[PDB]
Design a protein around this ligand. Sequence first.
Ligand SMILES: O=N[O-]
Ligand SMILES: O=N[O-]
Ligand SMILES: O=N[O-]
Ligand SMILES: [Cu+2]
Ligand SMILES: [Cu+2]
Ligand SMILES: [Cu+2]
Ligand SMILES: [Cu+2]
Ligand SMILES: [Cu+2]
Ligand SMILES: [Cu+2]
Ligand SMILES: [Cu+2]
Ligand SMILES: [Cu+2]
Ligand SMILES: [Cu+2]
Lengths: 336, 336, 336
Amino acid sequence: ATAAEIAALPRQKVELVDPPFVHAHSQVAEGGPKVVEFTMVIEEKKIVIDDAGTEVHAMAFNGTVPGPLMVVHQDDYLELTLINPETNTLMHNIDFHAATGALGGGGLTEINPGEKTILRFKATKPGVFVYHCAPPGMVPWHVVSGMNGAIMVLPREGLHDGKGKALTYDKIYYVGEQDFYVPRDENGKYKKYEAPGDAYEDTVKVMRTLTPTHVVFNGAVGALTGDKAMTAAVGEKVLIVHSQANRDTRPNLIGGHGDYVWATGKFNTPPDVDQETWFIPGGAAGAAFYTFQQPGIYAYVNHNLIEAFELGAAAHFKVTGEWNDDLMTSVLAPSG
Amino acid sequence: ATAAEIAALPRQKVELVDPPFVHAHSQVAEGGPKVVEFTMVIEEKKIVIDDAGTEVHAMAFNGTVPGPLMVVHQDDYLELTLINPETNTLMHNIDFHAATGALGGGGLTEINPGEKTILRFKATKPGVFVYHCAPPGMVPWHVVSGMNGAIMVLPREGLHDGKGKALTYDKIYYVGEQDFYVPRDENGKYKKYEAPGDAYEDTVKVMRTLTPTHVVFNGAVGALTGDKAMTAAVGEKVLIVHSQANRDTRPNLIGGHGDYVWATGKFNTPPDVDQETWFIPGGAAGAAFYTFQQPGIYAYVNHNLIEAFELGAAAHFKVTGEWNDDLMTSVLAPSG
Amino acid sequence: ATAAEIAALPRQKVELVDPPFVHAHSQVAEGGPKVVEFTMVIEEKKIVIDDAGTEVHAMAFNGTVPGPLMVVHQDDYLELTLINPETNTLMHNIDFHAATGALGGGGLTEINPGEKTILRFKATKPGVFVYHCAPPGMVPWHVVSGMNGAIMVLPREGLHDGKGKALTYDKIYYVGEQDFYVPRDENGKYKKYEAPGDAYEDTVKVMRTLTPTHVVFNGAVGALTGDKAMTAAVGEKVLIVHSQANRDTRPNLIGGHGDYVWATGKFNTPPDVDQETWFIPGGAAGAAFYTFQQPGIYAYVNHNLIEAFELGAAAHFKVTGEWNDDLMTSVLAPSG
Ligand SMILES: O=N[O-]
Ligand SMILES: O=N[O-]
Ligand SMILES: O=N[O-]
Ligand SMILES: [Cu+2]
Ligand SMILES: [Cu+2]
Ligand SMILES: [Cu+2]
Ligand SMILES: [Cu+2]
Ligand SMILES: [Cu+2]
Ligand SMILES: [Cu+2]
Ligand SMILES: [Cu+2]
Ligand SMILES: [Cu+2]
Ligand SMILES: [Cu+2]
């Protein structure tokens, strides 16, 4: 398509919402290709990542860790207006794994504090993809400071299983997983810093151990539990998009399964089925589809249980509904 | 299925055998759905895991690490009687990744010493699945203390390749891989403790480094080598079920291949073929089918060779039969 | 085939080239089965792996790290003459994951300094496979000293996608990823040694942490950048073979994609498509096929960005051609 043809295309402005929720969208594409517009302001800000009050000088797209999920359809154009406020101190940019060229847009979006840029790319490949800051010379630090998220490019005909059968979810959740490397003092207590730069040297040292001090969902230990636990009901079909821009993860819905899992996150690659624990390599997004059959609490975790329960990679699902004794029943409850 | 129908199903008690061996079963189901009954007694006991007398206070299903492999067919019901003797001191339960509901059954099987429980669940999905102890608050600790195993839910029609061609094995082995985190004193000597709880704080510290001191098959370094090597003959078809409940692994039959590998461990997902090294994420089981073509010794290992030969993740296969010079031959033996 | 039938097959002597380039070959098999001959001299030599002058006592096949890529077709016989010069001080051998029997040939190829051997095996399975030194007793050490490579066994009919369409590449590159464990002194400085054996005790201790000090492509940090960046042109089809003999990796062509990726490295296993980041387990090789659509610099990395940018696992592609504004364009360049 020529510039003229693209300028004639309809344009829709979408308002992003904070993870784990996803902005309103249609699974089946409406009309022909469109230029979907998104705006995100970068905010360098202090966030607390655990109950002890541990701090991280985050670099967050739209002010959240992970950045929000942007949703478009295959062959739509994603036009992102990216803003780096003069209140920030570092240069920032964005790399869309879903895009093609200039390091995912990285080479065309380098913005200093006080600048903005508008990048447009054709979403030619269907699936979920990671996006993240990629400044030449300080990539890992910015990424593990939370500057990453994901987008979903839906097939124009919505989701289907490997054999051509439609898969329509009732709800969708985006679980961004983040590995944090927080310096500790001689007492083994997490250190705090006045400015983000102050922490760089100590942090690089921790990063070199390839051992995160924290592995969390939605920016903090327990962020998706309690009044913020995800929800569903027996019978409900749920799509769980999961991303990790720097380190491997292995999602598992404890008490359930991954009925259809596009482990590689790409829709033209048939999904695996009946999964117990699936695998998403660092630098990628994956997605799992499940129809709940039992009510009660579920633990959604990175299945290296130390990472899940000692480091913070665990969420919960609260599911309402009738218990099914055919699937499972306590013949004899715990007793003498 | 009606209520009367389940109650009318034939009940069958099966006697378990210790890994790497598997209890008697039929690949193709025999008769309609059944309620397959198993019983496992929990044993807390000190075991030696290496050639240096290193000890671990194990928590073991049926007294073995890994716990035994339970085999049923899709749509049978697995009815497990789980016993926690009054001689034990810790709380236990069981999570079946193959099951649906109550956190895999963990929420219905919490038993203290002196208690027993009976759990029944319908094996609705075919494949090999991990099962492990999972009491709220002490999940990773108990799991890395060896309280995990796997089950196999065979398709009623047995296994088939991606083209619908039946895959019938002559022998089946279950290799459970265990990551252990044993504390060391300031001199580097592994510590010993009087009771399980005594080692808790020291052990969690090692666990948080995400670096196991040992990675073993069947509970100890060398457990599946020498006089305990697994066996086969040229021409025999063997299925090797492999599990790892907490950490990733990458099996490889050195000298052979994985002719058909259900890397994810789920039979409705077509197997990969001609594999050199496959990958099983922590929290899952996988299965590899192979037809031996050459006699001799084979090393079956986790292919991060440091984990295999420095940490303990290596086993052997001793295969009888005639050598095939077409496949391989020494044209010129080592010489000056 | 009988010994006589094999002896009558046509022979072809191949001259190997240093990675990332690959020796001349035909994607589609030229004629029936043949005995393809290769010769590799083992070289124990010092290599400098980073800009701080860090040394490693390398054990390199054909003098490089990784060893060169050998290409044959399915059902051809690979006949390798391996030489261990009197100048070397260690026993060496070779294990081909592509072969069948005697530990991949390791049991039939043990040669001391001053010895040579000739091994022939039938390449019965198509795909890319790892090969590495495998002495009984000192495996991980030699492997992580750089003694590993890969071979490609192409289907007689060349490559095809999952639907049977031919995938013909214009260029092919072989990226060997190496994890190094270099000892340091109490001041955090990398130690140097006068002979290979001198660093053994120290290296094992570092290997036990399972945390490499360096993760590099083609033997050194920046080896595949600058004067050695890989090249291509818009419209060109490129196959990127990638191997890791001891540790997991997750390749990603930043700016592009993996249009077709045989992640497990085996050609009879359908390739995944439109990949952002793929996964290759330690002890295996994989291959990705991509058609460039945009000119410019691309970063090819292990997508754990710490491993890529702090540890060394990063390469570059320099692509020439016309920029495609339909796929990506800067609507608004960085500005106030
Ligand atoms: O922009 N590097 O993944
Ligand atoms: O039951 N938690 O993996
Ligand atoms: O030959 N050991 O991977
Ligand atoms: Cu940034
Ligand atoms: Cu940045
Ligand atoms: Cu990236
Ligand atoms: Cu237990
Ligand atoms: Cu327990
Ligand atoms: Cu589990
Ligand atoms: Cu060697
Ligand atoms: Cu060697
Ligand atoms: Cu190997």
